[PDB]
Structure 1
């Protein structure tokens, strides 16, 4: 042994007498070989879920998971079952597919997992400090409560005409439409839908003043900030490049605009119930008496508007794209519009939107086939035992849940790759809590999260924007259906999703051809 330990020291010094080319070679080949050896030893472990084999250390399965995560999940499921782990850019990700996985991740105890440890670098450089994932979970819960106070049924009743006004304004003024001058045209829906989404959301949630700013060069800052909302932030949140300086500058200037309005309303004591800014000005004191700063209010507004921006814009893009090859669905939806709105002689209201089940089923079905968020993550903070298994998920791992994968499984949605709005007949609610409820701080929500359909997540991190999204999408599609027909250019069909973007938006350019149902119809103003 003593002689062996001498030759270890000798071996260590001979390593350094190696030619530098042979040294860097060993610096590479040794981790490769050890990674394989480590995986082979790891597969022996019975308190660990199977780990997907991978050749490149640290990188792991990043390429196949990044580009086609559902195909990746399906292959891993056949080989290993519903629980399995894979390496992703230096992280170990433990996936739990299906309703039991929804339950394991979305209902995990607060002390067991942390969303903000998974997401802080993704969002904080875009939204700003002190909100969403740049704060403890208890602050997030109350921020969600504050925002939900502007998302009441009475708010939605007031938002519907404002959103309708913005859609008609876009049809009238946008170069993509100009309905008073053109009866047919071609659009890229990943151009039109982001613009319609920010116009309708800024007008209703942010209010008249902030919508007005979008008619100026200030809109360029929104574009700059929006570019900053990218999954590259997971690995490179800050780099000395113009991309990041334009983003940071936009965050400062946009939040500065929000703060200017806030401080001006406070100065004049002009604080009503007009928008989410009014609401947060009156309702943003935490339960320990600490008040959100004006900077934090502005940053929360950015986060809310930006999250709702990308999910909603992608979703209305997918609705239009699925309907472009379904003139039968367009026709059905049009008949429902004519019946509910008395041939168009009734103005659309929030109440009447609730009397349009087929419209709401079309949104529901689009969200089944196109979950905007294919993977939701948490960092594991304490060792977690997987029930009915011998598995223990150790702290330092991440858990990954994918309701969007199960949305596309035949076992839960027969013919899952068929767009069929009638699978939701007499089940047209955006979601339906069936039994026991629980309040994490922002209102009672469903205690169970085992539904195979979870477009809005569940548990403490559940979306609070579901009813706003349905309101916004409902008004927008109601008007689209009543005003236009649309179809594909010859030989085109629904594009595949881009799974590497911030949401699973359509791979572009995704073009449709519209035509006015009434070429003589004029939009005033």
Structure 2
């Protein structure tokens, strides 16, 4: 017995390895991880306590490419091969997807100790919003921040925001080069140009107030653009490599929060603290229950976060509404009749209460949010091994879970002819959402306990959206005025564009152009302008 003579050759083989020509060493630096990764997946598939893992050729990268470009097609293929729960590798991360209403329950209603949203999201949002708020703080702090913000999102606030938002839409029709309704009776617009502008203008005026809205008439508006460019998915992957747009982002966060603090300190200086906007509200109502006050910097940062949370969701949504309606003059016609009925042929000024008597308008918003959920995937990082009910699967800590209610929105089983835009599928069901039973309060108000609805555009559980009613108010006013003022249609041979999922906000693929025409060519919009 001389195995020892073989152990010598292990050592010998090792030294011959280190002496390979650089050409072959490089090749082996490639081939070894490639082979190991394939061997690893084969072994992994034998485990019974793990959901099926989607096969991938390139290590670390995983299924990133296909998930990035066409996530719903990716989900549908995986769902056919493996069923509703499956994992895939995404740039060094393992993502476990749970499709359908049971998936909604598993992720949105997960125990606070099981999963973390801030662990998934903070590296992307913290540099944009600033420190101390949203995901740069314990969940209990987030809960109270949401409570604070909801305090300026009351029915009473919406009654005051509606004429403010309407003024901004009319000003945009009057003054924007995309319209100029006093000078032109027809024109062509790119809805991915107009809607972000209309969105920030209307949200600024109502949530931040007249001063902050005035700032957007200046070069200052470009900081918002800069801040926005630091909010892309490459910041998800590489949170900070010293790139140009990273620093413009940091600069913008400091400059914009600086402007908000300036106004906050000015208002406190003059005791000019009213009930006009979210700034007034947070100045009066931002003390945590342990008695610690939000700093002025944190208040400013939270303002940025709130405006940002409403910016891309709403802008994408009003863009899709215009795009679906552009090939549906029958739906424009039907919405126009409702406007004439509810507002007495235009004789009534639009109010928040009359908005609630516009079911078809609200069903249009509801249906667009069904077909175009602006966030195709929501994430949590798994913090404790999770057992998946009625399976033998365990999702270990360190994995991520991914939930996609927008995918379920597009399934025939839950919405017949799911790829058909039909506002009447919501007849006698025009509410933005509603708790279909028992409620629960995580610290920012009573919300639905069950999150099993196949329709979940605002998510659910502790991380549930609080901007839903603001969004309906904003989109409601905006679409009410579009409908009463304009008709619109596609250029010849154009139709509803397919979604672009790469910004991870489900935008229409540009350029998404429509042609508008004034319903009343001679109608003038009053007020002064240069």
What's the TM-score, normalizing by structure 1?
0.99
Deviation at residue 244 of structure 1 after TM alignment: 1.3
Which segment drifts farther, 242-251 or 446-455? 242-251
Q: Report Cα offsets for 1:335-365 as digits up to 9, x if no partner.
A: 0000000000000000000000000000000
In the aligned structure 2, how far is the partner of 1:95 from the partner of 1:502?
A: 16
Deviation at residue 216 of structure 1 after TM alignment: 1.1
Deviation at residue 242 of structure 1 after TM alignment: 1.9
In the aligned structure 2, how far is the partner of 1:165 from the partner of 1:102?
A: 39
Q: Report Cα offsets for 1:210-244 as digits up to 9, x if no partner.
A: 00111111111111111111111111222322211
Q: Report Cα offsets for 1:50-93 as digits up to 9, x if no partner.
A: 00000000000001110000000000000000000000001000
Q: Gapped runs of 5+ residues in structure 1? A: none
Which segment drifts farther, 134-143 or 1-10? 1-10
Q: Report Cα offsets for 1:473-502 as digits up to 9, x if no partner.
A: 000000000000000000000001110114
Residue 397 and residue 2 in structure 1: after superposition, are their counterparts in 2 closer, same or farther (change >3 A)?
farther
Deviation at residue 172 of structure 1 after TM alignment: 0.2
- Secondary structure at the residue paired with 1:6? helix
Query: 2:321, 2:364 within 8 Å by CA — same for their partners in 1?
Result: yes
In the aligned structure 2, how far is the partner of 1:35 from the partner of 1:111?
A: 31
Deviation at residue 5 of structure 1 after TM alignment: 4.0
- Counterpart in 2 of 1:149? 151
Residue 399 and residue 483 in structure 1: after superposition, are their counterparts in 2 closer, same or farther (change >3 A)?
same
Deviation at residue 8 of structure 1 after TM alignment: 2.8
Which segment drifts farther, 34-43 or 238-247? 238-247
Residue 274 and residue 23 in structure 1: after superposition, are their counterparts in 2 closer, same or farther (change >3 A)?
same
- Secondary structure at the residue paired with 2:517? strand
Deviation at residue 7 of structure 1 after TM alignment: 3.1
- Secondary structure at the residue paired with 1:479? helix
Residue 53 and residue 275 in structure 1: after superposition, are their counterparts in 2 closer, same or farther (change >3 A)?
same
Q: Report Cα offsets for 1:270-301 as digits up to 9, x if no partner.
A: 11111000001111111111111111111110
Query: 1:365, 1:420 within 8 Å by CA — same for their partners in 2?
Result: yes
Which segment drifts farther, 308-317 or 122-131? 122-131
Tell me whether 1:346 sits opposite 2:348 in the alignment: yes
How do residues 87-236 of structure 1 correspond to structure 2 at under 5 angstroms?
A: 87-236=89-238
Which segment drifts farther, 148-157 or 224-233? 224-233
Residue 5 and residue 300 in structure 1: after superposition, are their counterparts in 2 closer, same or farther (change >3 A)?
farther
Residue 273 and residue 3 in structure 1: after superposition, are their counterparts in 2 closer, same or farther (change >3 A)?
farther
Deviation at residue 3 of structure 1 after TM alignment: 4.3
Q: Report Cα offsets for 1:364-414 as digits up to 9, x if no partner.
A: 000000000000000000000000000000000000000000000000000
Query: 2:101, 2:454 within 8 Å by CA — same for their partners in 1?
Result: yes
Query: 2:104, 2:405 within 8 Å by CA — same for their partners in 1?
Result: yes
Q: Report Cα offsets for 1:129-148 as digits up to 9, x if no partner.
A: 11111111111111100100
In the aligned structure 2, how far is the partner of 1:278 from the partner of 1:61?
A: 47
Tell me whether 1:393 sits opposite 2:395 in the alignment: yes
Pairwise CA RMSD of aligned residues? 0.8
- Secondary structure at the residue paired with 2:487? strand
Residue 157 and residue 2 in structure 1: after superposition, are their counterparts in 2 closer, same or farther (change >3 A)?
farther
Aligned residues: 525
- Secondary structure at the residue paired with 2:508? coil
- Secondary structure at the residue paired with 2:221? helix
Q: Report Cα offsets for 1:404-445 as digits up to 9, x if no partner.
A: 000000000000000000000011000011111110110010
Query: 1:128, 1:299 within 8 Å by CA — same for their partners in 2?
Result: yes
- Counterpart in 2 of 1:257? 259
How do residues 247-286 of structure 1 correspond to structure 2 at under 5 angstroms?
A: 247-286=249-288
Deviation at residue 9 of structure 1 after TM alignment: 2.9
Which segment drifts farther, 268-277 or 233-242? 233-242
Q: Report Cα offsets for 1:1-52 as digits up to 9, x if no partner.
A: 5444443333222211111111111111001001110000100010000000
Query: 1:229, 1:502 within 8 Å by CA — same for their partners in 2?
Result: no
Query: 1:310, 1:502 within 8 Å by CA — same for their partners in 2?
Result: no
In the aligned structure 2, how far is the partner of 1:150 from the partner of 1:489?
A: 42
In the aligned structure 2, how far is the partner of 1:136 from the partner of 1:232?
A: 25
Residue 10 and residue 277 in structure 1: after superposition, are their counterparts in 2 closer, same or farther (change >3 A)?
same
- Secondary structure at the residue paired with 2:507? coil
Which segment drifts farther, 183-192 or 227-236? 227-236
- Counterpart in 1 of 2:433? 431
Residue 267 and residue 502 in structure 1: after superposition, are their counterparts in 2 closer, same or farther (change >3 A)?
farther
Residue 4 and residue 106 in structure 1: after superposition, are their counterparts in 2 closer, same or farther (change >3 A)?
farther
Of 480, 484, 502, the match for 1:500: 502
In the aligned structure 2, how far is the partner of 1:232 from the partner of 1:124?
A: 14
Q: Report Cα offsets for 1:182-223 as digits up to 9, x if no partner.
A: 000000000000000000000000011100111111111111
- Secondary structure at the residue paired with 2:443? coil
Query: 2:382, 2:397 within 8 Å by CA — same for their partners in 1?
Result: yes
Query: 1:160, 1:350 within 8 Å by CA — same for their partners in 2?
Result: yes
Query: 2:376, 2:504 within 8 Å by CA — same for their partners in 1?
Result: no
- Secondary structure at the residue paired with 1:94? strand
In the aligned structure 2, how far is the partner of 1:516 from the partner of 1:334?
A: 13
Residue 415 and residue 30 in structure 1: after superposition, are their counterparts in 2 closer, same or farther (change >3 A)?
same
Residue 35 and residue 268 in structure 1: after superposition, are their counterparts in 2 closer, same or farther (change >3 A)?
same
In the aligned structure 2, how far is the partner of 1:485 from the partner of 1:225?
A: 34
Q: Gapped runs of 5+ residues in structure 2? A: none
